[PDB]
Amino acid sequence: GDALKEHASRSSRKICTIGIAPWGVIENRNDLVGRDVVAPYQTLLNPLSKLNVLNNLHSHFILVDDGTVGKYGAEVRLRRELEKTINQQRIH
Amino acid sequence: QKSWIESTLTKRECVYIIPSSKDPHRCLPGCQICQQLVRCFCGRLVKQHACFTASLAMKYSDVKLGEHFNQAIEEWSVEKHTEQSPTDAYGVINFQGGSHSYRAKYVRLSYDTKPEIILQLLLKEWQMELPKLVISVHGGMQKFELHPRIKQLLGKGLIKAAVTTGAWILTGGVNTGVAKHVGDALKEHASRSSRKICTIGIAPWGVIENRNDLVGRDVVAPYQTLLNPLSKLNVLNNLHSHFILVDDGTVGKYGAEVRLRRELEKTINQQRIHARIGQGVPVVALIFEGGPNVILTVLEYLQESPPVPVVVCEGTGRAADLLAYIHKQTEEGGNLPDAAEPDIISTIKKTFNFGQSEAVHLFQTMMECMKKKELITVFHIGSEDHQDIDVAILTALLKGTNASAFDQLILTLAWDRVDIAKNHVFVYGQQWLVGSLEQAMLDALVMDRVSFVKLLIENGVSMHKFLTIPRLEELYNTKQGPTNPMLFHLIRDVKQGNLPPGYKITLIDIGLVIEYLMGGTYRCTYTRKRFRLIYNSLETKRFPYPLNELLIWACLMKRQVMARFLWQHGEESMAKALVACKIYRSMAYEAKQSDLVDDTSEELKQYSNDFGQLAVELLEQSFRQDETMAMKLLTYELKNWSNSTCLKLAVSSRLRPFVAHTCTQMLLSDMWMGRLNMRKNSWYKVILSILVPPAILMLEYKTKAEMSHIPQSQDAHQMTMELPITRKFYAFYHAPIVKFWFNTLAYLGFLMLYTFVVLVKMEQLPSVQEWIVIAYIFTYAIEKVREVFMSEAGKISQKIKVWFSDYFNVSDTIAIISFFVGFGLRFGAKWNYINAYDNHVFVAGRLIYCLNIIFWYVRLLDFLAVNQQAGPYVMMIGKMVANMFYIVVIMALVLLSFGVPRKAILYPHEEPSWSLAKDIVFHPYWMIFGEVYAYEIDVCANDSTLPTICGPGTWLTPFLQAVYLFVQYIIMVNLLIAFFNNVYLQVKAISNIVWKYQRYHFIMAYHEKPVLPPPLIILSHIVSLFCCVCKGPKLFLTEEDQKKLHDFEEQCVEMYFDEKDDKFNSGSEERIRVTFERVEQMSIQIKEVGDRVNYIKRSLQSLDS
């Protein structure tokens, strides 16, 4: 992300970054909730904690509902498959 | 005394006359010399005391008989034996020097003046702005010079630190040390910071060259700047602006500054740096090139409660290069390395000749200084340490003082230093409380600190959560920033004309101001039910779009740089720019209609046109990407701006470049068509179809998709769902292009009949032709009353006033009124005489008709003005009449200057008559138009047609007429040709814009005009009225189309800023200067490497042997 803002409004419509993160380690899991909502998510480092935030300069997210807060191991099974299924597509 | 200084501050004259130490010099008898040489321990020869009380002590022998028990000779005290008396000198010295007088000031206060009196002296008596920083430089005196590297830099940072922070630089002032380097740095940056840096020399009234020249109650003493040779005495350094000379003691003794200068360093800190801010004013100390009592002073400032931090610029001299290394051999706050007595006290013995008699005493002062190195900032020169000390001075106040980052941020905010905070306060790992960055945002907005608002938004302040009703209330009510006085003038004009005592402004009142400024039917969110209810009750207490509310704030507070910034954030950028244009335009108007002093009507009219241009430039950007989506932007309802459209907002502000833009003109052309595809069709098939109704069924109409960008009536958009036979007739007769030709043919047929009526003989009863003419004008007149009483603006007196601003509506009004005067006289006239024209009332009626018809032929220019070529020329004709007025006035005067003499010479036997008025103007006018009256010029010639006019003096009239026509044709007619040739292009250009602009109101009018033309329009009046008793155009967009349009707007605004940054960063002027600056930088490093490689040559010597 920090590299995106140093080259933003030049590649802001060609680079589709994707965060395949879990629905575990994240600050406001409940603010992300809401069927078809436009949830106004924050970008302030919530102090007095270790929880992490979705990096603002990304464009797409695949949050993974499982488990709980704290456990963040359920991405390797899916993210890897995406790395396998894009390759079986024909480039052109 | 007529002066606060004269009644408050004092002198200290040594009344008591201690003889000098004890011993006379020479000269065996001890009565002359015990008087003469033997000075006072005061410090002057005996007669200079001039004691008003004891002036007759010296004549006797002296004050205080000799012996006096030696103990009691030191009993003299500055405190006791010194009459406190007035100042006797406070004024304005000057310095004949580097091309300026470089003026300054002195008070010459005593010494034991109270500390508060200085602050009162500095701020009101001298009228000095309280600073945001205080630099207290220190060091030793009378040193030669520095490295030419460091010398240039120390100023460059010292100046920069002081000018950007409104700082005071406390010096000794005397041009024999610290002050010299300060001053020498000032002249290298003078006439750039000569009005922001208020240096102060708190020097004594002792060591100085001409103490007596500084004397003089309220004088402008012309003090010198030449180094008086054959001496050691010092001069006041010219480049200082203020002095506090300390009257005590004598010449030579220079120790009475520490008691006062230090107090000033203590009393400024107890002042609050700013009203909104609670932190005290900081004090810093830059020691360069110091001495032994400095090392005492450094530790005296660090040990202080609270500590005053310290800067040390290594290499300037002893104390700097010393301390820079003496607090390098240490733990962070603890102990020294392997026993450091030898090497440390070595240099302390070498720099200061001690020999262990005073070599531990300094080292003991050192080991106390290293207990706090966090406050001893040290500017490591060579390795680009903190870049030109300004960081090093300022960050020293931000290095360890256990001050929260909230206090580290406000201090940058008061200084207006963003680079410091971003690089040294918003550092990785930094941690913040919950509303600390909120309180910092409130301060930055109230203080108009625009660049700190940016820093806080980026770092993560959220305006959706920050902005609230009570905060946003405050932002209007603050008097702690660059306010607008005129806002109250608009509030008190909407409230009731009055105001309560303090009147904390409410947001409903702001809502009322905006409605007054935005005008029309604008209704603001602040005057709505829900806001009016909830505000009474004062998330609910937040705002959905906070940057729409702050843009309004910044524009009503006349805070333009904040307005431009806030504009670039959020959505609806083109709309916000057009609202800002309208707010400022209306503010500029009421400023032009208020008896205040600072008119601010060109500042506001310029701010309006700045946002006006932004809207125009965003439209062009959008139009270059997609014409059809750009036309939608003009007409979508906004819903945050009273359900208006961007085009209506621009029309409201009379913004012609927006309305005359080709995108807006393309849309207006498409609305002119209606559902008709007038690309596949021709104007003669439209006219054919108005006369042949069944030909309506063989025109090329437009699909609902081709109409997607076009606003429509509700009834017109429901018939888009499919095209059946009857829907197609609707599409035809409701198109504005059809209503035009349908009214244009009826008007032409109206003129043909009315021309027939006036040209053909008139009988008692009106003919069928004349009846049809009357019906047209009657119904045409009702049609105009409909247009006025259904226009836009509610207020009749505004509806009236706008409609009578158009040329042709004034003429139509005169035309309609004059016609029915004529019909009344024509029709109401009783024929007593059988031969018409015996009845004068009838004649006056008919002659009104024959003159009223002129109005109706000229109205054809309004129809012709619908053409793109013709219409501008019609507008030009009126503009050229206005502009040619004074040339024509001069021609009228030349005409009379000829006409009056001609008539007087040729007709000398006339009695008074109104024919005289005719005869002086008649023939001279027709001469302008090619009629010289050839056989009337010389009335005494054989071929004359006026032989009876031949008489005395008549030979003069040909000379007069020859002069007259020379002046009219050869000069005045050709001046007018030259006038028109030279103003043509600028008038044509203005007329095209005005033509294009007035095309909005013309096309919009034909959407509300009835289908039927003015003779048959009565049905559309009666029917429509009656159907209403039995019971504007909008763009309709799907939710997905609203999505894709809001995204289109955002995309094109982003392109707009990118193409500007890339157009400016790619210009040659910008590449030359970045090239310039980078070549400037290299030219240092090239030489710097040049020095290093020349010192790797030192290697070659040592390495090879």
Ligand SMILES: CCCCCCCC/C=C/CCCCCCCC(=O)O[C@@H](COC(=O)CCCCCCCCCCCCCCC)COP(=O)([O-])OCC[N+](C)(C)C
């Ligand atoms: C049946 C018959 C009965 C009645 C018959 C009589 C009816 C009379 C009919 C009169 C026509 C009425 C038209 C008035 C239009 C007003 C609205 C308008 O646009 O005004 C504008 C134009 O300025 C004017 O309109 C001022 C008057 C213009 C002159 C009109 C009559 C001239 C001919 C009389 C010749 C007499 C000759 C006598 C000797 C031979 C307002 O001004 P502006 O545009 O802001 O201008 C700014 C100028 N600037 C650019 C320098 C800044």
Ligand SMILES: CCCCCCCC/C=C/CCCCCCCC(=O)O[C@@H](COC(=O)CCCCCCCCCCCCCCC)COP(=O)([O-])OCC[N+](C)(C)C
């Ligand atoms: C927004 C701008 C546009 C709208 C403006 C609209 C309003 C503008 C204003 C309009 C009014 C203009 C003046 C009217 C005439 C009065 C003057 C006069 O001389 O009258 C004469 C006729 O007197 C009669 O009674 C016979 C005329 C019948 C009425 C026709 C005029 C009124 C219609 C209005 C239609 C327009 C209404 C439009 C729809 C409501 C009286 O003289 P006499 O008796 O013949 O002679 C006596 C001598 N004798 C012995 C020789 C006989």
Ligand SMILES: CCCCCCCC/C=C/CCCCCCCC(=O)O[C@@H](COC(=O)CCCCCCCCCCCCCCC)COP(=O)([O-])OCC[N+](C)(C)C
């Ligand atoms: C290049 C070609 C030109 C050459 C120039 C040489 C000049 C030589 C000068 C000649 C003047 C003498 C000629 C006329 C003889 C006197 C009596 C007489 O007949 O008077 C006649 C009029 O005229 C006058 O009464 C006086 C005319 C003087 C003006 C002449 C032009 C002066 C130069 C230029 C001035 C401009 C400014 C100059 C400076 C810049 C009588 O004529 P009438 O009207 O029929 O009257 C009789 C009928 N009644 C009895 C009923 C009244």
Ligand SMILES: CCCCCCCC/C=C/CCCCCCCC(=O)O[C@@H](COC(=O)CCCCCCCCCCCCCCC)COP(=O)([O-])OCC[N+](C)(C)C
């Ligand atoms: C600053 C510049 C100066 C310009 C030059 C000086 C000015 C010109 C000088 C002219 C010479 C002077 C003429 C005197 C003639 C006297 C004769 C007489 O009897 O009276 C005549 C004088 O009375 C008039 O009224 C006519 C005057 C001539 C007007 C010329 C205007 C044209 C200007 C031209 C400018 C272009 C100049 C071109 C370049 C040179 C009238 O005659 P009458 O009334 O018929 O009398 C009865 C006679 N009959 C019985 C025979 C019919």
Ligand SMILES: CCCCCCCC/C=C\CCCCCCCC(=O)O[C@@H](COC(=O)CCCCCCCCCCCCCCC)COP(=O)([O-])OCC[N+](C)(C)C
């Ligand atoms: C409001 C909107 C109107 C729209 C028009 C449609 C409605 C109106 C249409 C027609 C009305 C005709 C009424 C005729 C009445 C019968 C008697 C008569 O006048 O006979 C005349 C024959 O007729 C002519 O000489 C024609 C006169 C009208 C000329 C204009 C018609 C063309 C414009 C409109 C049409 C084309 C449209 C053009 C534009 C594309 C003979 O002359 P007189 O008059 O008997 O002589 C009087 C002599 N006296 C007074 C001394 C005694």
Ligand SMILES: CCCCCCCC/C=C\CCCCCCCC(=O)O[C@@H](COC(=O)CCCCCCCCCCCCCCC)COP(=O)([O-])OCC[N+](C)(C)C
């Ligand atoms: C806003 C409203 C303003 C106007 C209000 C209404 C005004 C009404 C005005 C006038 C009404 C007059 C009524 C009659 C008065 C008594 C005289 C009489 O009856 O007969 C006499 C009429 O002699 C004339 O000269 C009449 C002239 C009047 C018309 C003036 C029109 C002004 C309108 C201007 C335009 C305004 C435009 C306004 C818009 C811009 C004589 O008739 P006779 O018996 O045949 O005598 C034969 C004599 N003989 C022997 C010589 C042959």
Ligand SMILES: CCCCCCCC/C=C\CCCCCCCC(=O)O[C@@H](COC(=O)CCCCCCCCCCCCCCC)COP(=O)([O-])OCC[N+](C)(C)C
């Ligand atoms: C029964 C009767 C049967 C006959 C009925 C039919 C008869 C004919 C009827 C009418 C005559 C006009 C016909 C020609 C039209 C041409 C088409 C055109 O482009 O028009 C334009 C004219 O737009 C107007 O508004 C013109 C106004 C016409 C009236 C003015 C007459 C002046 C007379 C005073 C002189 C005295 C002369 C007096 C003579 C005695 C409109 O197009 P545009 O807006 O310019 O387009 C530009 C934009 N674009 C580039 C995107 C395209």
Ligand SMILES: CCCCCCCC/C=C\CCCCCCCC(=O)O[C@@H](COC(=O)CCCCCCCCCCCCCCC)COP(=O)([O-])OCC[N+](C)(C)C
């Ligand atoms: C029967 C006789 C023949 C018939 C007549 C022929 C028909 C009549 C002919 C031409 C009429 C042209 C129509 C007007 C065109 C539009 C102009 C307009 O909108 O406003 C103009 C105002 O206008 C004026 O100031 C005056 C307009 C012209 C009046 C001319 C009257 C005729 C006589 C006069 C001579 C009498 C003296 C001689 C007497 C010896 C704008 O000018 P502006 O202020 O610079 O621009 C601001 C515009 N804005 C506000 C929109 C931004």
Ligand SMILES: CCCCCCCC/C=C\CCCCCCCC(=O)O[C@@H](COC(=O)CCCCCCCCCCCCCCC)COP(=O)([O-])OCC[N+](C)(C)C
């Ligand atoms: C400023 C210089 C000084 C003036 C003198 C020099 C000027 C040059 C020349 C000479 C002047 C004219 C003299 C000749 C005519 C005399 C004969 C005569 O009677 O003529 C006439 C009258 O004439 C007069 O009464 C004279 C009026 C002179 C007015 C001033 C002229 C302008 C000078 C401005 C110069 C500026 C030049 C241009 C700018 C560079 C005809 O009268 P009558 O027919 O005999 O009367 C019988 C009447 N009865 C039948 C009823 C009974």
Ligand SMILES: C[C@@H]1CC[C@@]2(OC1)O[C@H]1C[C@H]3[C@@H]4CC=C5C[C@@H](OCCC(CO)CO)CC[C@]5(C)[C@H]4CC[C@]3(C)[C@H]1[C@@H]2C
């Ligand atoms: C700046 C300009 C300087 C010149 C000028 O404008 C301004 O100064 C004006 C003064 C006017 C005269 C004043 C009074 C009368 C009396 C009247 O007596 C009725 C007689 C009869 C009618 O038939 C009764 O039956 C007749 C008209 C007359 C002579 C005026 C004529 C025009 C004059 C000369 C005008 C001229 C154009």
Ligand SMILES: CC(C)CCC[C@@H](C)[C@H]1CC[C@H]2[C@@H]3CC=C4C[C@@H](O)CC[C@]4(C)[C@H]3CC[C@]12C
């Ligand atoms: C003083 C009165 C009694 C004598 C007649 C006055 C003259 C000058 C009047 C009578 C009719 C008038 C015309 C009537 C209509 C128009 C059309 C308008 O768009 C411009 C002015 C213009 C062109 C008028 C100019 C002046 C006018 C010609």
